[PDB]
Amino acid sequence: PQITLWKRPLVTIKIGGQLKEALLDTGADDTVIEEMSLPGRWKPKMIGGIGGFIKVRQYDQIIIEIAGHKAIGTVLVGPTPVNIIGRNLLTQIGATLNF
Amino acid sequence: PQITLWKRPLVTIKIGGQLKEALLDTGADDTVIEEMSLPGRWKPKMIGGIGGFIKVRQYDQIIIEIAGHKAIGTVLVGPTPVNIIGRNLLTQIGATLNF
């Protein structure tokens, strides 16, 4: 698709069998999702946003579908205000910015 | 142009007679710039994201040039970690996300 930006670029994702809403976010290096259960071990990560820092749980090699496009990669889990799909997964789905 | 997302999508902007580097940010509703002076009226606002909220000054009807493309709109000024070009100005330069 070609997604214009008059509204938030929200898509459906599928992670852990479940559908969620998420924001396609070119300003995010990494993908950050609200609290949920994921398999395997996690590693610590601190990320900084507009208001300060939050600790998240880093899960690697997670299967995740974004707007119907299959990806496998890192997902950060923690107290984000909204689910955000960052560049690590935008690159897997072949997304670019165009003007 | 077509901008890939292997790295942060940074561009040069001109705002208030100054050159700055800023991130093209589809996850940002509004444009947020580090502390600077702008002409005209403003009003206070709180904006939120990862890590909580910051207080900003809202200036309306500000001209900007984003990677060579002019537009006009609201600019929020305050203690953002990164200068952000949000959707309110990305729409005006015709930016889309494509995959």
Ligand SMILES: COc1ccc(S(=O)(=O)N(CC(C)C)C[C@@H](O)[C@H](Cc2cc(F)cc(F)c2)NC(=O)c2ccc(C)c(Nc3nccc(-c4cccnc4)n3)c2)cc1
């Ligand atoms: C109404 O208008 C507005 C309201 C809110 C905003 S916003 O809050 O800016 N935001 C809203 C979304 C979160 C929904 C836009 C979003 O793209 C922001 C833009 C941003 C990037 C950044 F980068 C630092 C910042 F403030 C801000 N993304 C993240 O916060 C972001 C997204 C993902 C990650 C992983 C990180 N943090 C990060 N990334 C890599 C490394 C580190 C790091 C590593 C080691 C030490 N410290 C930091 N942190 C940050 C904008 C306009």
Ligand SMILES: [Cl-]
């Ligand atoms: Cl739109």
Ligand SMILES: [Cl-]
């Ligand atoms: Cl990844």
Ligand SMILES: [Cl-]
């Ligand atoms: Cl505006």
Ligand SMILES: [Cl-]
């Ligand atoms: Cl349009």
Ligand code: NA
């Ligand atoms: Na004004």
